[PDB]
Amino acid sequence: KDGTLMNEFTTPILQEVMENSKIMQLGKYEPMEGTEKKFTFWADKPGAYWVGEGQKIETSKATWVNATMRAFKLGVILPVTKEFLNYTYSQFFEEMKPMIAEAFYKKFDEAGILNQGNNPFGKSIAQSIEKTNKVIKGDFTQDNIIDLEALLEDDELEANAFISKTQNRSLLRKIVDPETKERIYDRNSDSLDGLPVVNLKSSNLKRGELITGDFDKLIYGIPQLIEYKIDETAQLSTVKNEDGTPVNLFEQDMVALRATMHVALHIADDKAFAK
Amino acid sequence: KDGTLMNEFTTPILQEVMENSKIMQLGKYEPMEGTEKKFTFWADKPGAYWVGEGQKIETSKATWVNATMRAFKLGVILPVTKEFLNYTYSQFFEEMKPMIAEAFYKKFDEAGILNQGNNPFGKSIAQSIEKTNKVIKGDFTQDNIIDLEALLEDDELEANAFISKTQNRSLLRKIVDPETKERIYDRNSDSLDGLPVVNLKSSNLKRGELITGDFDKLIYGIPQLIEYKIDETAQLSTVKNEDGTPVNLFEQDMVALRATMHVALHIADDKAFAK
Amino acid sequence: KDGTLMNEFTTPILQEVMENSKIMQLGKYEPMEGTEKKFTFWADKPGAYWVGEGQKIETSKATWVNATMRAFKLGVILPVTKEFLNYTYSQFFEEMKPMIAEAFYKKFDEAGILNQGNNPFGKSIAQSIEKTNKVIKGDFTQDNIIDLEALLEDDELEANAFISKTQNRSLLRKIVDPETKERIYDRNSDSLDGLPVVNLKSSNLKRGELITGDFDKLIYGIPQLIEYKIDETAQLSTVKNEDGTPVNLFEQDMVALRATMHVALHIADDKAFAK
């Protein structure tokens, strides 16, 4: 029962999502340990005659929270016996070692970009929106896009790239100004004010494009190694009983990964409101 | 306590039983997967004048049930510490890897030949005797042997080789015809009608020789590999407690084996009856 | 939390204690198996005229009890994750493989020398003091040292070397005769009668120097090997639960060691008494 050999092919959507997630982060200068901290604040005070003005700047803030990749899989447990007997299932498991690692990289970037997704807690757009008021409620408009861009530009510096989902892109392309084309209307990516927007995969976000300022990304690197003892959910196919076993049966190779993201001071956000 | 080094020698009876079990099966053309099926049936219908006779033959039957070899042993668990310390016990365990594999091959052939032995269920003589009436009850006789051979020859084809146990061979050699020698009486194996009988090890069978028609045998091949985590019965010698351990202590190397036997249409059988 | 990298240096006291423990034993001719036994007893009987004197000597006594080194450590379990990430903790664990093995060698010699320390039970000074009266109660004195030496010399042979602790050495150096210097008074080790005393680490002994006769030492040799499944005490740092796990998490490499000590007939002992 349930013993058949079949060839499996990798999906094209997973490869496109992995490239989109890497471009959305835009990290610079990767470090092994979380030691880097911003100290600049700039203090200045003016007088008129015979006055002693005091100026001092001191700050320390470092974020370090590693996210581990998935080890043993419940679906791979049934395929473990198929991998030993058939060459087709063994080749599929080898391709899965690179497929799941890209998916783990995509989920790490999603946790910082979206407030609902939690993995590191207190990084990128998720920490910026809760601490400082930047997100605007309502429908997307050409006049509203110019107003939202001005508020983001006022906080220290101006935004370079904006992350947008495919579902949000459809609503953005539909909206157009009376005289100006604004939303694409040719071949290139649509721009709200001037700068081009980059595509990013999102599950929590549905409507509205969010822009990110400056954020550094650092990762150790995803590796693949076979493991004999690993904690997994109980599963039975034929003539087997499982209740508290982890060392007796191996399902999938344990992947080790460590990635850390630097927290941003201010980030632009947009969300649709319904009443 | 219980710590002594001694040299062990392999028994001659196990080697003879392994060769007898391989000859008794008489398998032809081994396959990796159970895909082969018999389709021939032969249909024929005769008439006289202006008649439309319909003839069609279609059949599909494939048997596939793999039998796994024994892994960790309870007797080898006490010998595991002796193998690490002494070279004599380690050499005995290496010889046991080939000895138990031959015993596993002998048990697989016994399951098809004898109805009581179950491993695959629904193969060779065990499936033929239950589905079709072929076995005869009573004492072995020269006139009875000729009558039993005629019934086996009527079903499709004639029998080539008959499997016989050592206990059944003693009763067979004692019986002899009034004019003809019949049972050996020289040097070669005893024949009931004409064709020679092959020796086979049997635990369930006691009296009466059983003949097998055509049956194909296919096996992947017995291998030996060391294992750290394997489910075994609890055992304690000195200063140890066991209740639910499989990964902590290793007893014997886990042997992997897969063998499948093709089901036969008709097979001759003989058994003694008592009242 | 609790994640910092720091360089660790080996202590000088552990190296000095290891050399002192090896010198205190003074074992000769090492054997793999406990088969050696003393048979000599010497029997003699004298007469005068027409007398038949019978003389016979037969004896058999062999001691064999192996002591195993420590495997997984509770302190190393927290350092296991630090060893994989940082090179400083991994180098400290490699040095610990040789440090703990020397400590295990020191504890084995302490079990025979001191009655309180049990590992083998029935070896060296621990078996000699309980079976035969040799230990003297009271304060250490120059006249008492000469009296204690005479009792030890009477039993078969004379003592060659005496084991002394650092705490007992301070009291021994303070005591001195009216005319003779006795206790060191130059540079070399202090002698009670003539022969020099060797330093040995002791936890049970506090006052009084004990002398050992003849005792053979035999050991297989300490080795280091990595283990996946080993029984250890439950420990948790962050987001982990432990109750009955040994195979899932590895703390330290399992060291295998076997050492045996030959029992002595008579050994000198000294202890202080308080009323």
mmCIF file of C-alpha atoms in Angstrom, chain B residues 37-260:
data_model
loop_
_atom_site.group_PDB
_atom_site.id
_atom_site.type_symbol
_atom_site.label_atom_id
_atom_site.label_comp_id
_atom_site.label_asym_id
_atom_site.label_seq_id
_atom_site.Cartn_x
_atom_site.Cartn_y
_atom_site.Cartn_z
ATOM 1 C CA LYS B 37 1.745 -11.291 -14.782
ATOM 2 C CA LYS B 38 0.393 -14.313 -16.685
ATOM 3 C CA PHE B 39 -2.184 -13.528 -19.396
ATOM 4 C CA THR B 40 -2.516 -16.850 -21.281
ATOM 5 C CA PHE B 41 -5.745 -18.855 -20.874
ATOM 6 C CA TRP B 42 -6.554 -20.221 -24.388
ATOM 7 C CA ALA B 43 -10.184 -20.133 -25.583
ATOM 8 C CA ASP B 44 -11.625 -22.336 -28.354
ATOM 9 C CA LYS B 45 -15.151 -23.063 -29.633
ATOM 10 C CA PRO B 46 -16.281 -25.373 -32.521
ATOM 11 C CA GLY B 47 -19.466 -25.391 -34.633
ATOM 12 C CA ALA B 48 -20.908 -27.030 -37.760
ATOM 13 C CA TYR B 49 -22.484 -24.551 -40.228
ATOM 14 C CA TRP B 50 -23.119 -20.762 -40.108
ATOM 15 C CA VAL B 51 -22.005 -20.184 -36.493
ATOM 16 C CA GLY B 52 -20.135 -17.292 -34.850
ATOM 17 C CA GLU B 53 -17.788 -18.510 -32.108
ATOM 18 C CA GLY B 54 -16.229 -15.997 -29.696
ATOM 19 C CA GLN B 55 -12.784 -16.542 -28.168
ATOM 20 C CA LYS B 56 -10.996 -14.173 -25.762
ATOM 21 C CA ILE B 57 -8.261 -14.484 -23.118
ATOM 22 C CA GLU B 58 -7.294 -11.846 -20.529
ATOM 23 C CA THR B 59 -5.642 -12.320 -17.115
ATOM 24 C CA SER B 60 -3.553 -10.290 -14.641
ATOM 25 C CA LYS B 61 -1.957 -11.606 -11.424
ATOM 26 C CA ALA B 62 1.164 -10.289 -9.662
ATOM 27 C CA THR B 63 2.502 -11.116 -6.184
ATOM 28 C CA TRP B 64 4.855 -8.827 -4.233
ATOM 29 C CA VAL B 65 5.629 -9.184 -0.508
ATOM 30 C CA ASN B 66 9.138 -8.489 0.833
ATOM 31 C CA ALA B 67 10.503 -10.245 3.933
ATOM 32 C CA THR B 68 12.997 -8.339 6.108
ATOM 33 C CA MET B 69 15.969 -9.959 7.878
ATOM 34 C CA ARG B 70 16.558 -9.799 11.659
ATOM 35 C CA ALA B 71 18.371 -6.749 13.070
ATOM 36 C CA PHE B 72 19.407 -6.624 16.765
ATOM 37 C CA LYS B 73 19.646 -9.875 18.752
ATOM 38 C CA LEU B 74 19.053 -10.501 22.477
ATOM 39 C CA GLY B 75 21.888 -13.069 22.672
ATOM 40 C CA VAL B 76 24.299 -10.725 20.857
ATOM 41 C CA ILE B 77 23.604 -7.939 23.409
ATOM 42 C CA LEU B 78 25.642 -9.745 26.102
ATOM 43 C CA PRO B 79 28.353 -10.544 23.440
ATOM 44 C CA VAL B 80 28.532 -6.871 22.318
ATOM 45 C CA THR B 81 30.896 -5.941 25.186
ATOM 46 C CA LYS B 82 32.873 -9.162 24.561
ATOM 47 C CA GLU B 83 33.326 -8.232 20.870
ATOM 48 C CA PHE B 84 34.942 -4.882 21.779
ATOM 49 C CA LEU B 85 37.342 -6.420 24.338
ATOM 50 C CA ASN B 86 38.126 -9.821 22.756
ATOM 51 C CA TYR B 87 38.889 -10.636 19.100
ATOM 52 C CA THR B 88 37.218 -14.085 19.297
ATOM 53 C CA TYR B 89 33.690 -12.706 19.883
ATOM 54 C CA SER B 90 34.136 -10.043 17.161
ATOM 55 C CA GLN B 91 35.071 -12.721 14.586
ATOM 56 C CA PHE B 92 32.020 -14.785 15.637
ATOM 57 C CA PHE B 93 29.722 -11.780 15.039
ATOM 58 C CA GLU B 94 31.236 -11.266 11.556
ATOM 59 C CA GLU B 95 30.495 -14.917 10.673
ATOM 60 C CA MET B 96 26.955 -14.507 12.088
ATOM 61 C CA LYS B 97 26.204 -11.787 9.483
ATOM 62 C CA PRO B 98 26.385 -14.507 6.721
ATOM 63 C CA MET B 99 24.931 -17.324 8.880
ATOM 64 C CA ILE B 100 21.671 -15.535 9.815
ATOM 65 C CA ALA B 101 21.218 -14.259 6.227
ATOM 66 C CA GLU B 102 21.257 -17.871 4.961
ATOM 67 C CA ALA B 103 18.769 -18.802 7.721
ATOM 68 C CA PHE B 104 16.511 -15.909 6.624
ATOM 69 C CA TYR B 105 16.704 -17.234 3.038
ATOM 70 C CA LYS B 106 15.736 -20.726 4.284
ATOM 71 C CA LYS B 107 12.735 -19.383 6.255
ATOM 72 C CA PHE B 108 11.401 -17.497 3.195
ATOM 73 C CA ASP B 109 11.306 -20.705 1.107
ATOM 74 C CA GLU B 110 9.705 -22.589 4.035
ATOM 75 C CA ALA B 111 6.809 -20.080 4.206
ATOM 76 C CA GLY B 112 5.777 -20.873 0.608
ATOM 77 C CA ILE B 113 6.316 -24.645 0.857
ATOM 78 C CA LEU B 114 4.524 -25.125 4.210
ATOM 79 C CA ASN B 115 1.005 -23.855 4.998
ATOM 80 C CA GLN B 116 1.723 -23.307 8.725
ATOM 81 C CA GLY B 117 4.689 -20.961 8.132
ATOM 82 C CA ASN B 118 3.542 -17.415 7.346
ATOM 83 C CA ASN B 119 5.715 -14.534 6.088
ATOM 84 C CA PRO B 120 4.321 -13.448 2.638
ATOM 85 C CA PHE B 121 0.867 -15.167 2.820
ATOM 86 C CA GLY B 122 -0.530 -16.427 -0.505
ATOM 87 C CA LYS B 123 2.461 -17.933 -2.335
ATOM 88 C CA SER B 124 3.632 -21.301 -3.766
ATOM 89 C CA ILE B 125 2.321 -24.524 -2.116
ATOM 90 C CA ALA B 126 0.590 -22.717 0.791
ATOM 91 C CA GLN B 127 -1.816 -20.892 -1.567
ATOM 92 C CA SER B 128 -2.263 -23.850 -3.961
ATOM 93 C CA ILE B 129 -3.391 -26.378 -1.307
ATOM 94 C CA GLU B 130 -6.030 -24.091 0.268
ATOM 95 C CA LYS B 131 -7.596 -22.910 -3.023
ATOM 96 C CA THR B 132 -7.508 -26.228 -4.936
ATOM 97 C CA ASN B 133 -7.872 -29.809 -3.662
ATOM 98 C CA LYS B 134 -4.571 -31.645 -4.243
ATOM 99 C CA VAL B 135 -3.437 -32.982 -0.839
ATOM 100 C CA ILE B 136 -4.204 -36.637 -0.042
ATOM 101 C CA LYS B 137 -4.694 -38.094 3.453
ATOM 102 C CA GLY B 138 -3.246 -41.460 4.525
ATOM 103 C CA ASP B 139 -0.075 -43.570 4.696
ATOM 104 C CA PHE B 140 2.551 -43.566 1.917
ATOM 105 C CA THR B 141 2.308 -46.427 -0.606
ATOM 106 C CA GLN B 142 3.744 -47.438 -4.015
ATOM 107 C CA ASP B 143 0.256 -47.616 -5.587
ATOM 108 C CA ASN B 144 -0.745 -44.336 -3.880
ATOM 109 C CA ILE B 145 2.353 -42.547 -5.261
ATOM 110 C CA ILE B 146 1.354 -43.382 -8.862
ATOM 111 C CA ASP B 147 -2.227 -42.187 -8.213
ATOM 112 C CA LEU B 148 -1.045 -38.883 -6.676
ATOM 113 C CA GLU B 149 1.333 -38.236 -9.610
ATOM 114 C CA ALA B 150 -1.500 -38.586 -12.171
ATOM 115 C CA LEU B 151 -3.626 -35.885 -10.477
ATOM 116 C CA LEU B 152 -0.678 -33.441 -10.441
ATOM 117 C CA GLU B 153 0.129 -34.139 -14.121
ATOM 118 C CA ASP B 154 -3.477 -33.416 -15.212
ATOM 119 C CA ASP B 155 -3.359 -29.786 -14.003
ATOM 120 C CA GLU B 156 -1.703 -27.917 -16.930
ATOM 121 C CA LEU B 157 1.750 -29.613 -16.902
ATOM 122 C CA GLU B 158 3.778 -32.403 -15.226
ATOM 123 C CA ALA B 159 5.904 -32.020 -12.069
ATOM 124 C CA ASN B 160 9.708 -31.924 -12.421
ATOM 125 C CA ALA B 161 11.024 -31.913 -8.824
ATOM 126 C CA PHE B 162 9.586 -32.920 -5.432
ATOM 127 C CA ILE B 163 10.627 -31.488 -2.050
ATOM 128 C CA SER B 164 11.091 -33.960 0.825
ATOM 129 C CA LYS B 165 12.107 -33.695 4.495
ATOM 130 C CA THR B 166 14.652 -35.949 6.274
ATOM 131 C CA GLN B 167 11.997 -37.362 8.654
ATOM 132 C CA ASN B 168 9.693 -38.125 5.692
ATOM 133 C CA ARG B 169 12.622 -39.656 3.746
ATOM 134 C CA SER B 170 13.154 -42.348 6.425
ATOM 135 C CA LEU B 171 9.549 -43.577 6.044
ATOM 136 C CA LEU B 172 9.802 -43.338 2.228
ATOM 137 C CA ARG B 173 12.999 -45.450 2.090
ATOM 138 C CA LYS B 174 11.428 -48.152 4.308
ATOM 139 C CA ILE B 175 8.510 -48.665 1.884
ATOM 140 C CA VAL B 176 9.319 -50.820 -1.167
ATOM 141 C CA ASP B 177 7.390 -52.646 -3.919
ATOM 142 C CA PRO B 178 7.107 -56.501 -4.263
ATOM 143 C CA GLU B 179 9.133 -56.633 -7.520
ATOM 144 C CA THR B 180 10.622 -53.146 -8.071
ATOM 145 C CA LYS B 181 13.165 -51.500 -5.734
ATOM 146 C CA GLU B 182 11.549 -48.014 -6.076
ATOM 147 C CA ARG B 183 13.112 -46.295 -3.016
ATOM 148 C CA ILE B 184 16.798 -45.615 -3.884
ATOM 149 C CA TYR B 185 18.372 -49.065 -3.120
ATOM 150 C CA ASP B 186 21.780 -47.953 -4.521
ATOM 151 C CA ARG B 187 23.280 -44.455 -3.962
ATOM 152 C CA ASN B 188 21.133 -41.857 -5.787
ATOM 153 C CA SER B 189 17.983 -40.110 -4.466
ATOM 154 C CA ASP B 190 14.713 -42.079 -4.231
ATOM 155 C CA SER B 191 12.093 -41.673 -6.979
ATOM 156 C CA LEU B 192 8.367 -42.449 -6.650
ATOM 157 C CA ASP B 193 7.518 -42.534 -10.384
ATOM 158 C CA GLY B 194 10.673 -41.559 -12.323
ATOM 159 C CA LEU B 195 11.952 -38.061 -11.499
ATOM 160 C CA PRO B 196 14.440 -37.557 -8.579
ATOM 161 C CA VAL B 197 13.493 -35.811 -5.314
ATOM 162 C CA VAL B 198 15.393 -32.896 -3.739
ATOM 163 C CA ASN B 199 16.035 -32.498 0.006
ATOM 164 C CA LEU B 200 14.487 -29.518 1.828
ATOM 165 C CA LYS B 201 14.382 -28.410 5.480
ATOM 166 C CA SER B 202 10.880 -28.327 7.004
ATOM 167 C CA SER B 203 9.555 -27.762 10.542
ATOM 168 C CA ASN B 204 5.783 -28.061 9.952
ATOM 169 C CA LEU B 205 5.932 -31.107 7.636
ATOM 170 C CA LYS B 206 6.582 -34.545 9.170
ATOM 171 C CA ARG B 207 5.277 -37.187 6.723
ATOM 172 C CA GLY B 208 4.610 -37.150 2.964
ATOM 173 C CA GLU B 209 6.506 -35.617 0.038
ATOM 174 C CA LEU B 210 5.199 -32.486 -1.715
ATOM 175 C CA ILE B 211 5.918 -31.584 -5.356
ATOM 176 C CA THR B 212 6.071 -28.049 -6.792
ATOM 177 C CA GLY B 213 5.341 -27.006 -10.391
ATOM 178 C CA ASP B 214 6.573 -23.668 -11.743
ATOM 179 C CA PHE B 215 7.462 -20.765 -9.425
ATOM 180 C CA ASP B 216 9.707 -17.746 -10.067
ATOM 181 C CA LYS B 217 11.993 -16.360 -7.342
ATOM 182 C CA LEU B 218 13.289 -12.776 -7.137
ATOM 183 C CA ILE B 219 15.455 -11.177 -4.428
ATOM 184 C CA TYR B 220 17.235 -7.820 -4.009
ATOM 185 C CA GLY B 221 20.167 -9.288 -2.034
ATOM 186 C CA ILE B 222 21.086 -9.542 1.654
ATOM 187 C CA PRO B 223 23.370 -6.747 3.048
ATOM 188 C CA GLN B 224 25.030 -6.015 6.413
ATOM 189 C CA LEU B 225 25.167 -2.548 8.014
ATOM 190 C CA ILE B 226 25.834 -1.281 11.556
ATOM 191 C CA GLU B 227 23.003 0.551 13.349
ATOM 192 C CA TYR B 228 22.913 2.733 16.483
ATOM 193 C CA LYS B 229 19.132 2.978 17.028
ATOM 194 C CA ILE B 230 17.069 -0.233 16.792
ATOM 195 C CA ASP B 231 14.033 -1.562 18.698
ATOM 196 C CA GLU B 232 14.897 -4.583 20.876
ATOM 197 C CA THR B 233 13.779 -6.461 24.021
ATOM 198 C CA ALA B 234 14.998 -5.243 27.437
ATOM 199 C CA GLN B 235 18.021 -7.023 28.952
ATOM 200 C CA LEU B 236 20.233 -6.391 32.001
ATOM 201 C CA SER B 237 23.485 -8.022 33.160
ATOM 202 C CA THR B 238 25.136 -5.809 35.821
ATOM 203 C CA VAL B 239 24.368 -2.263 37.097
ATOM 204 C CA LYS B 240 21.920 -1.503 34.247
ATOM 205 C CA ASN B 241 18.185 -0.781 33.933
ATOM 206 C CA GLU B 242 16.175 -1.175 30.711
ATOM 207 C CA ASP B 243 12.486 -0.441 30.049
ATOM 208 C CA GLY B 244 12.213 1.541 26.787
ATOM 209 C CA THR B 245 15.682 1.945 25.259
ATOM 210 C CA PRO B 246 16.659 1.405 21.555
ATOM 211 C CA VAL B 247 19.076 4.262 20.714
ATOM 212 C CA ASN B 248 21.296 4.150 23.837
ATOM 213 C CA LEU B 249 22.661 0.597 23.414
ATOM 214 C CA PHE B 250 23.533 -1.350 20.247
ATOM 215 C CA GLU B 251 23.345 -5.162 20.174
ATOM 216 C CA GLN B 252 23.741 -6.315 16.541
ATOM 217 C CA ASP B 253 24.092 -4.849 13.023
ATOM 218 C CA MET B 254 20.800 -4.306 11.161
ATOM 219 C CA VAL B 255 20.454 -6.535 8.084
ATOM 220 C CA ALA B 256 18.324 -5.337 5.153
ATOM 221 C CA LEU B 257 16.728 -7.897 2.810
ATOM 222 C CA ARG B 258 13.888 -8.010 0.262
ATOM 223 C CA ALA B 259 12.624 -11.208 -1.404
ATOM 224 C CA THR B 260 9.469 -12.002 -3.403
#
